[PDB]
Amino acid sequence: DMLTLTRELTQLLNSMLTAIKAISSAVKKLDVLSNSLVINMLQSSYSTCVLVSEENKDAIITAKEKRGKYVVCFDPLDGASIGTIFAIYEKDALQCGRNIVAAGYALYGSATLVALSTGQGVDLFMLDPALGEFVLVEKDVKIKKKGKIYSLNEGYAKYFDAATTEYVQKKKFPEDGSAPYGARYVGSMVADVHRTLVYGGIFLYPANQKSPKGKLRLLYECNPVAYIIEQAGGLATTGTQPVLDVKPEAIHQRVPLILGSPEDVQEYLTCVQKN
Amino acid sequence: DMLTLTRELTQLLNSMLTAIKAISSAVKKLDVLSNSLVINMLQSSYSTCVLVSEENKDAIITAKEKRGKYVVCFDPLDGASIGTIFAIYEKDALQCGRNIVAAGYALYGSATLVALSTGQGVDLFMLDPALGEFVLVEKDVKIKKKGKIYSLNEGYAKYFDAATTEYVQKKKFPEDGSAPYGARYVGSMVADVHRTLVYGGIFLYPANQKSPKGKLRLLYECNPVAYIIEQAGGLATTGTQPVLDVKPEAIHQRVPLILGSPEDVQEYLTCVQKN
Amino acid sequence: DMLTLTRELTQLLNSMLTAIKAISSAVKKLDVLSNSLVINMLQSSYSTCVLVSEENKDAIITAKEKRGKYVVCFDPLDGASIGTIFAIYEKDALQCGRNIVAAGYALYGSATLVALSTGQGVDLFMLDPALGEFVLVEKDVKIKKKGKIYSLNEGYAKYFDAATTEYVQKKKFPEDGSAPYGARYVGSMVADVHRTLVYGGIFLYPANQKSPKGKLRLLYECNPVAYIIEQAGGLATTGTQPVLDVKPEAIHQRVPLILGSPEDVQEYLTCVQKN
Amino acid sequence: DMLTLTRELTQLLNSMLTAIKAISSAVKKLDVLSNSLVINMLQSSYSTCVLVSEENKDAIITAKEKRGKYVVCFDPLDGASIGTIFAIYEKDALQCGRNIVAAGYALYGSATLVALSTGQGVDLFMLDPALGEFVLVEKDVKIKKKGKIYSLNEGYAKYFDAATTEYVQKKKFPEDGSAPYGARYVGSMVADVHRTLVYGGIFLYPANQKSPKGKLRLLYECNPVAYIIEQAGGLATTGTQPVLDVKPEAIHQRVPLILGSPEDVQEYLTCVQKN
């Protein structure tokens, strides 16, 4: 019942974590609050030059007094089961996801949880609010090759393209005498993606008739989780190419998102190719 | 930035709340732990004679030393977004839901939340862990007449009966030029029911081919939430009769559960009648 | 086991309280940290023009962008049993204590406690960290007419003046067949003063040979607690005049402090007069 | 900003710690509450046969169902700055302190702190309430050879024996041109002893005219802290022999307590010998 504790890009990550700490205890003026917490704590790290936020139309240039080498694209507050999303890399904020040096998300649940990766796999952390610090609870998290959960808003079935319609059909009526997958959809991305990571399976927000480029945002929603998910041995596709290979044409560009267990995503891609 | 605090069946409810407090900070040996916490704190209130638990095969008779007039059926730990469910009333534990004097649930999220009702509407509470007490955050909660969210596991589509198949079809393809409903399904009952209460709409765990009597348990899952939901102006049906009117034929009896906004549930019932 | 919560100078006090909240969870770079927390949260209230801090040589003038009518003298971190002290009123910071509109202290113990007064008695509050707000636990706190505790550093006995020597002698060897007083001295002012308020008795940091003007600071140590203590029905003297009547001749001026139950302080004054 | 955690007598200590956890968040029916928390958690460890409590007249024999090899003498709640004290070893509870296998105290401050020793020095712990576990913050704590603080209730000066009178005189008026010691006396033993450990110096509750055997209790006040203090390189005497060498003649026997920096206690003993 007794324990011991053991401990510029590093600088940046500690500040993002501190903002996540702050955001956590504060959990729509809340959107505003959490937004400025990130902006300001990020701008005190002396390691940023350009920030991209889901809450600001244009990129936020760090004054040279406090300027450093990294670029941070974030969604300060996404969605209980609310989240924060970020990736570290105005032209400097339009890099494809493959240039990501670091990224992660926090999920504000019964406990505040952080998935983090700097290119050598994914680590899961838990905010110890008493200590005011993040505790490692799992190293190098790896996703199942194949799961049994599919996760999308089926209320858009009327707007689905053929591939999505087909893939969902295969999940409910496997033509191979196997059990249908279970369905789960919280409707908060961080929460659905995090379940997908630890339990396995697939999460989709594809293009549909009413959102032809999907809903979720490339720079600070899709690219970050795609990075996390791939570092855990999964896949993240738009349906036509890996999310991390999209070349951003605007900082609030949307893309389709399909990610998860690699064999599930590969099954989806098969449905797309064969139309 | 300053506040003032203001304050036998009552006895029973404080003990259930205390167990919920304990359960909350402890959040599969966890199932065992939470179970005994309820049993023992309930048996110290000197107000129970018969307990029914999701974790115990048979009813748990209170010794006469500590015996009182009420009967408690509970699910100590259901399912982040885990919950606890209870209703207050061995033959003494097989009453139909209409004899309920009190019931509620807790949802262990970013905050621990309790929906409670003693027959005069529903009150929402928040556990103040610092104070170690529950704070009123909303009185007489009322559900929307009609919502725009439907919530069920569609991975069972292959096992759905005709009415369910039909109703889900109507939600995606409204034949009235209205928008399709949105879908949400966390897969934890307390979490799905609680969303249904505050946002409106409908939650279904109907009978299907593989679970012909549904999955959820009458005494300490379905009856409790049916009570909460009706006290908030909603409906809770098995498809053929109000949940609270089922006459229990066994303490772990299952029933179908459809509940929520009354006009949504009434639409469902229409689909059942007309088959 | 259930509760309800009920709710420009007001603005200023909420910000001081917020800084006390922040200081509380952060509890010598700590001195620096707590200092800036007060300064900055006070300067965001748009209600200050001049701040005086124990940590800054000179007064801190609020820019006109954020300027308001009140002056705040504070000790951000005094001294477990650490505290924060403040009074609300550069010439504008050299007012005698009688111009005080509001003052108080926080004591960071097992719980964070605030004694507060705006001229109509003293109220005691407890920081509810979960709620992030201060809860009233006692209104109009009144001190005993006479106590049985005396509190000073007797390790300075060799430096005491005659009156102090005499008074301490009378406490140990009452010449009236009454019990000697008990002694208590934590060595943190907020902690010793707070005990004096709730239990009664007397607290002394008189002049001595090595500190001829006493040790404690008039503007943000002595004046504040003198205000609190008098609003609770006590006295606060330098030995020659009420603390709140001293005319400040410098912002870090020291004065002797004797305060507490009025009959105890009056006994002390008798010892001074008769030398 | 990220951390990793690393982990029958052992059994007993974890349960004592758990009770300290419980006691901590509950911080005179409080005396009663904390008492039963210790008794019951100690009796669930299956490692005790005889308990001695400050709150129970007679020793508390563990039923054989749950009987083990160790004996625990404790003060569940002593005295903010409240504490809990215990030593591990009815005849089985009257052993001299030298048979102690383990002992410690908790101090319930701004943080809950535990000093612990099992014969190989003293370790300091901090309760991490979030983790619900105790974190090591300092290993093998060692006390100063000599301090500059003396700590006793001088309101008993009229009842002091000659040695105490003399020693206190030497502290205020050093006959060697050295500074007088500072005085500190919180009046809660755990708090005064803990300050003595980390800052150095001496703490006294000697015999006086009105308490000829001192006030503090041998089995669960004096023996425990004497053990802690000696394991940190200090001394603990009654004035005539080491506390840990007293042979208990009753389970609520009192003894004088003088402890702290060894050279300070040795100075005191000199004053006793030479009368």
Ligand SMILES: O=P(O)(O)OC[C@H]1O[C@](O)(COP(=O)(O)O)[C@@H](O)[C@@H]1O
């Ligand atoms: O209700 P829908 O259409 O299923 O969309 C839910 C999605 O929208 C989101 O709330 C994101 O919206 P934003 O892009 O505005 O931040 C995600 O968290 C979630 O996956």
Ligand SMILES: O=P(O)(O)OC[C@H]1O[C@](O)(COP(=O)(O)O)[C@@H](O)[C@@H]1O
């Ligand atoms: O995965 P499914 O089949 O959708 O079922 C999920 C349901 O099962 C539950 O976990 C209840 O299961 P239990 O009856 O064993 O407690 C509910 O919380 C939830 O609504």
Ligand SMILES: O=P(O)(O)OC[C@H]1O[C@](O)(COP(=O)(O)O)[C@@H](O)[C@@H]1O
């Ligand atoms: O050790 P001493 O001389 O008794 O002084 C203790 C006093 O000094 C203080 O720590 C204040 O010191 P500062 O004036 O530097 O803030 C008080 O809290 C306390 O009453």
Ligand SMILES: O=P(O)(O)OC[C@H]1O[C@](O)(COP(=O)(O)O)[C@@H](O)[C@@H]1O
């Ligand atoms: O007021 P006094 O006479 O100085 O005594 C204070 C002492 O009494 C105590 O409160 C202990 O009393 P108990 O023996 O009844 O537990 C100690 O914590 C403290 O050191």
